[PDB]
């Protein structure tokens, strides 16, 4: 199970962010315009109404994958490996083969 | 293939090349306040978790027992298995004893 | 590389869209991931506040930090005795750390963090569909006396463990509207106590600037033309979707995750030993079974229905 | 008053040891606006017209 | 018989010579802490 980790975007104010390719899993930057940014305190920057909001998004793993986690594998042949008791002659034997 | 098993695939838990396709769309933001929308396919692992039938430790004919590390199926009989056996001759005794 | 001292790192004020008023809010307390990867029904819950850690980053049990709604943002404790968690009723709170909980909940759709002060009533809520689970092939509310003792996968409660790691950055600009005053059509920076406060304008030319005192820096028009925020803040912060990053926004720190998944021998139920009545090419199973039981049957030939 | 769904309502008043309550039938469920069904309003949105 | 109808028996209420067939197994105690186990069928009259 994925994680989809979204970091904290980027703002720039009257200035373009055509966003850099990236080699992360599943990368998707997207870029906004007309974008008006507002945290908690006021208006985050001074552009009236030409800003361009780089968006970023990414994906990863979950913490917990270490033990949640299916192995993918091919399956060509497979070998016997028996176990055999042999006994004569009241002598005993237990092999491999 | 997104939205279903093998939509993120990586050679090692550690590993850095990891490769994704989850079908992340970004949005547009249309409140005031900063976030980024994102729209994403549900995590195929999960829904292969969900629709993952009965495992093979519970539907392998002939009675095999399938254990890991390593796999293999174990204590089923499907066939006959010709032995030849090179008896020694201490093992054997005469007639007349 | 992935420190613990905790002195250098600082909380945030998160984006979530449930607080006590019932609308998209800013609190103190926002859950960023819930995951309920357990067996015991037990969750971790990521919480854009400090725990267990003092004003200054010490190790302080029972003591938590968070960011203050005032324009002087400093960093504030309160009592760990005031948190509270629910998902449907109470939750116990198990294990606290830096940004990370183990709390053990009933089953629920939404999870909540809250804050039981005498006047600060902050919460915040996230949905996640927090479910019964159990480990085994017999249901059970809780696990009984009686058991098989099967291995499980279970969070562990000690704080020492580690799950992997999580980034961390030094923060952007944070804009205050409280640092610009509009007089006579005229801007004034307002910084209080002195503190040093850089500033961008941009209603004549891109003019930055610091100052720790009042200016008529170009005069211009508006205030809504223009920002001012601080910048004697160095303290890293987890990346989140309701930040701002600045410019070198590589990875700084790297911060333990809590709570790790230990592999745990535990318990499951025993079901009632059936009744086998034998005819001809068959049987036939009497089961009595309260909870949901698994019956799975296959034929040792080639064929395994 | 906003309330979770349930099957009644009820109103107390827990003065002098005692609540001297009352209960009403009332069929309350979580009702949802559009055409997506949501436990509580997200931040993205149409901003639909309700009542 | 069990898991049905006149799983317990008597010819009054109050007699002491009551009988029953419950298919009651005693388990062997796993667990340090004393205790018994015990897996019985469900009882027939709620059934019935
Ligand atoms: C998925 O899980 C849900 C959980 O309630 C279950 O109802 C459903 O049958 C499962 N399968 C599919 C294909 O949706
Ligand atoms: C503000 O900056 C000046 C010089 O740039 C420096 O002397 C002073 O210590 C700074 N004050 C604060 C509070 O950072």
């Given at each position: 199970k994925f994680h989809t980790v979204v970091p904290s975007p980027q703002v720039k104010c009257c200035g373009s962010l055509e966003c850099k390719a990236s080699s992360k899993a599943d990368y998707t930057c997207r870029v906004f315009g007309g974008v008006y940014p507002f945290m908690w305190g006021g208006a985050q920057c001074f552009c009236d109404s030409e800003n361009t909001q780089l968006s970023e998004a990414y994906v990863e793993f979950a913490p917990d994958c270490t033990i949640d986690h299916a192995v993918a594998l091919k399956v060509h042949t497979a070998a016997l490996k028996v176990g055999l008791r042999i006994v004569y002659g009241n002598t005993t034997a237990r092999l491999d083969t | 293939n997104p939205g279903a098993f093998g939509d993120i695939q990586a050679?090692?838990?550690?590993?850095?090349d990891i490769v994704a396709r989850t079908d992340i769309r970004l949005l547009k933001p249309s409140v005031k306040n900063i976030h980024v929308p994102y729209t994403q396919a549900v995590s195929g692992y999960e829904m292969w978790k969900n629709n993952s039938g009965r495992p093979l430790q519970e539907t392998a004919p002939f009675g095999c027992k399938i254990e890991v590390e390593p796999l293999r199926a174990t204590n089923c009989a499907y066939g006959h298995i010709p032995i030849s056996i090179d008896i020694p001759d201490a093992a054997f005794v005469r007639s007349s004893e | 590389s992935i420190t613990d001292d905790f002195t250098l790192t600082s909380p945030y004020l998160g984006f979530c869209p449930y607080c006590r008023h019932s609308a998209p809010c800013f609190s103190p307390?926002?859950?960023e991931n819930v995951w309920d990867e357990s067996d015991d029904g037990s969750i971790r819950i990521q919480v854009s506040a400090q725990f267990g850690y003092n004003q200054a980053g010490?190790?302080?049990?029972?003591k938590f930090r968070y960011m203050s709604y005032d324009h002087d943002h400093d960093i504030k404790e309160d009592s760990m005795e005031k948190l509270a968690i629910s998902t449907s009723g109470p939750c116990r709170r198990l294990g606290h750390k830096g940004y990370f909980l183990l709390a053990q909940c009933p089953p629920g759709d939404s999870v909540t963090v809250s804050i039981t002060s005498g006047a600060s009533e902050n919460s915040c809520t996230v949905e996640k569909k927090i479910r019964r689970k159990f480990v085994g092939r017999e249901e059970y509310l809780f696990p009984p006396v009686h058991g098989k003792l099967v291995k499980c996968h279970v969070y562990d409660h000690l704080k020492e463990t580690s799950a992997g790691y999580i980034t961390m950055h030094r923060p952007g600009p944070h804009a205050y509207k409280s640092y610009l005053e509009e007089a006579s059509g005229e801007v004034y920076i307002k910084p209080p106590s002195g503190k040093n406060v850089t500033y961008e304008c941009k209603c004549g030319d891109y003019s930055t600037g610091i100052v720790s005192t009042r200016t008529k820096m170009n005069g211009c028009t508006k205030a809504k033309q223009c920002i001012a925020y601080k910048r004697d803040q160095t303290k890293w912060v987890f990346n989140s979707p309701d930040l701002i990053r600045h410019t070198d926004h590589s990875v700084q720190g790297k911060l333990h995750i809590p709570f790790r998944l230990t592999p745990t021998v535990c318990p499951v139920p025993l079901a009632h030993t059936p009744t086998v009545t034998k005819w001809f090419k068959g049987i036939t199973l009497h089961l009595t079974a309260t909870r949901p039981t698994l019956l799975t049957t296959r034929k040792l030939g080639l064929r395994a229905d």
């Open positions: - | 050679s090692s838990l550690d590993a850095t | 307390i926002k859950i010490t190790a302080d049990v029972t």
